[PDB]
Symmetry: C3
Subunit: 398 residues, 3 copies
């Protein structure tokens, strides 16, 4: 009992859900359909629980990375946008929303790391990573630092590593070639070498965690930090005059940051599949649909070109999109979670001086793809196999 001639939608309670209900209210006045917008506890964990029984929302708004886990479990139905509508958003986005070579959701917003500098002590930010050794020495004169960011998290260091040539998995025609990890090619090796070199030369530091990093920019002790939109709402509080632009280029090559995409899919057992697709087609994905959601909580850079250009005037949005346009979509696959853990145990050891670059990266590849399925096959089996035998005889033992 998901619905019956109405649209109940799910979206995280920190989003522009009030602006969405306004789009649902304008939708109601136009067709005659009651559009409930909800925002329950850890929905992304509770959704695959009820949607498996055939219940819950008609539509669910979430970042694409968590969608592959639904799209595989047959919880999302395939969408069907005509080519006329497919051109309205962006070429790179659609690619973030296909599972098994077929579109599984409508992309809403976008999320990419950008370079945040202090215009007061640094009015013209660097175009490359190569003057940062030059810039830190100059900054050390006034008791300041050129760069200070979280090295304890792979997502933050990945823009540099993947800048020259490195890549997580090889995306081939809407079908990631899983057996093609790229944390070994000279590009990934030269990248991480540079990162550790800055730690060695003392142009940077090692124990910089997110707590320290963000709070080192708000007091104005550093010239630059790399961080995504979620940080903007803290630089305003700190008064600090802040500029946002494209990341610096390494070896002349543009940096590759991982790009998430807030997207909305349609439930597999949601009878109102037409209305759900109807609401999303020309009520939310229209200029206003987003303008209305944007007012409640700004969603950064949007998927829709037409409204993306209207929002482009804002430099921060303008740069986030430019960073996203040369970035790699964070793979929506299940082995992605093992990659992160592998690359994390790499960069921690590489920076610490436990393993020389070339060794820890080549180790990551061996204990990434191989330790990806090892537990997967085992856990996924020992969970379902025991569960199967646990639930079966207990059903008759009730």
């Amino acid at each position: 009992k998901i619905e019956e001639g109405k649209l109940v939608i799910w979206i995280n309670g920190d989003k522009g859900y009030n602006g969405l209900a306004e789009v649902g209210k304008k939708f109601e006045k136009d067709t005659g359909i009651k559009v409930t917008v909800e925002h329950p506890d850890k929905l992304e964990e509770k959704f695959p629980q009820v949607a498996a029984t055939g219940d819950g929302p008609d539509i669910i708004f979430w970042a694409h990375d968590r969608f592959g886990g639904y799209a595989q479990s047959g919880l999302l139905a395939e969408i069907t946008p005509d080519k006329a509508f497919q051109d309205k958003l962006y070429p790179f986005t659609w690619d973030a929303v296909r599972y098994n070579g077929k579109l599984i959701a409508y992309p809403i917003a976008v999320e990419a790391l950008s370079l945040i500098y202090n215009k007061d002590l640094l009015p013209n930010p660097p175009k490359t990573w190569e003057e940062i050794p030059a810039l830190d020495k100059e900054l050390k004169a006034k008791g300041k630092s050129a760069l200070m960011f979280n090295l304890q998290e792979p997502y933050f260091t990945w823009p540099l590593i993947a800048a020259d040539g490195g890549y997580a998995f090889k995306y081939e025609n809407g079908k990631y070639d899983i057996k093609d990890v790229g944390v070994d090619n000279a590009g990934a090796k030269a990248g991480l070498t540079f990162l550790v070199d800055l730690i060695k030369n003392k142009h940077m530091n090692a124990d910089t965690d997110y707590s320290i990093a963000e709070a080192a920019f708000n007091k104005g002790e550093t010239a630059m930090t790399i961080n995504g939109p979620w940080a903007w709402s803290n630089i305003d509080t700190s008064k600090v005059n802040y500029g946002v632009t494209v990341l610096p280029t390494f070896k002349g090559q543009p940096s590759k940051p991982f790009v998430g995409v807030l997207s909305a899919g349609i439930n597999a057992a949601s009878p109102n599949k037409e209305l759900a697709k109807e609401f999303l087609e020309n009520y939310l994905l229209t200029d206003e649909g987003l303008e209305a959601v944007n007012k409640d909580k700004p969603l950064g850079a949007v998927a829709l070109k037409s409204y993306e250009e209207e929002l482009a005037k804002d430099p921060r949005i303008a740069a986030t999109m430019e960073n996203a346009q040369k970035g790699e979509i964070m793979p929506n696959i299940p082995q992605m979670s093992a990659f992160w853990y592998a690359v994390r145990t790499a960069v921690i050891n590489a920076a610490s001086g436990r393993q020389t670059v070339d060794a820890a990266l080549a180790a990551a590849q061996t204990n990434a793809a191989a330790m990806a399925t090892l537990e997967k096959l085992m856990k996924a089996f020992e969970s379902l196999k025991s569960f199967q035998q646990q639930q079966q005889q207990q059903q008759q033992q009730q």
Copy 2:
């Protein structure tokens, strides 16, 4: 002990074993060799203990699915029958007895599921699945039911799931590309959807096992049941005037039931190779040779064309063969055992309503890839504590080198 120079034969019991002694009589005359037949108990597991060591029977009659594991263990010897002899049997029975491109057994009899109907309620049975709902209410008025067959089983339900396009492991070129299941494509979805509908719309029950099915048709409480030749004798004793025909077609596509070709194979450690392949190729696989066994215990439809027509006059056999022709040759690989438990839980979840079609169904592919691996890792685990444990320290090394 080495199997002996005579042709020693093993065979379960249910089949016409005394019928082989009559074939051994035509064989003891021309070539003059004593053809014994042992009827062992639980031999489907006692074979890789005697034939593994170099003993066991020269020949073994058994369903082809079990022959994969025998074949893979190197216990069975490859055969090469005449190209003209191969055309003596149905081309589809040949693909049943192959491993990695190599023929490893002689096909005897086929066996597929078929529609069984009570002539005194359905004088003309439906060719279409879609008419099951309409026929149910028409019979419910008389206090009856349209169809009733086992649901706690993938063997019986699969025919419908597979009907549209759903398959186990893909067969391409005398092999199985295992990394290519098909319990999730549109076909497999459309099928199980339809089956779950008859359950929720009350045209059909959910908790129906085999016991309730077979009996209800014998008691005349249903007008159709899906079953094989193993229940023919029971409906003979029920005194119920029953028919039998080709399975109902879903979505204009023929329903595909799992096949089961009974076959004989010559084991590797059986030096009496030529005799076996002589006796089997000619003496048993003659027009008359099959009569002999069939006369003891009926074999159902047979792989041999010429003799097939002879029995095909009985519609019961003609439809078993017509349904085998258009079905899945039950793959003889190790991963197949997993396919069962995964669909087993998939179909029971879909029927009880606790999950849904696409939901419980997409799980089966994840369960198929997850169950197969550990089973194909646990049989080495048992071997590591029996070859690197028992062979390394229990026996010889402690029994002589202590």
Copy 3:
């Protein structure tokens, strides 16, 4: 040590480290870089500890067989021998020091099983295995056996099993198709069948290890035995007129022993790679270079052509090179560990007569492909989850494998 501006070399306490050291003070004078030659304990284990951290020697001398885990763990650096230098060595040795298509070391010495025969009991040695039966009866009368070698080992039996057409994996350009395990084809069957036939035929015993075969030869109880260069020294002390020649041919085809190649690899962390390459190229590996090492302690067959044709004068050396050119460059991949164990139990079973040739040979490769992931993957995450999450002998893992009922 980390070095920086110098050259620290690890070899092995028993090889011609002195001869290498003389090349050390030779190179030292020509450039200005003092070369140190050290011989640590169990260095084959020590290297992947200290090298992984950016310490250890600049170059390492070891059998390419273990260089696979070094090249894979990213500890060794890629080399670049010019086209002219490539041709200077025996073509087949270059295949020994390749990883994922890349060269990861310089080959030095070659070591392959040979055929050692007593000249007194048997002047002209048999060139075929099919003659072993008839030769055995001939010697049985005089109270002697024709051949006795190690049977509780696949490194000694394999040469025959593979002689017909079998192999470990598949090398067809510069890679291994690991899903190819060829211990099952007619070759292996016909091979092992012959060997097992000999045991049942009583032409040879079943409970023969190394120590027995080495002793029975040296005492002159047997005519022939299969053994590498390492056993020569003991036959020298036994004063038994021995000769070494090519292995007996089976079914017309040459026999096939696994080839080992001593190699000199350069650490990835070495700041002075240029010196390491210049020392290993233009010094040690030119006639005189090896001439030094060989004099402190013999090397056997050598990767270099010029100095080989001069060493080959010794019949035994030219017979190791003959055997090696027909041998099977032993794979350095991590799967090789399981393969050995697999064949070990396959032969121990076939010899004892428990299972048929066809069974033991099919059951070998299934136990091998299952074993390849049972430990190389299981013990790989087992220790990773143990540490990165945390807060000779297989010793099997957990967890709970509940089946049925």
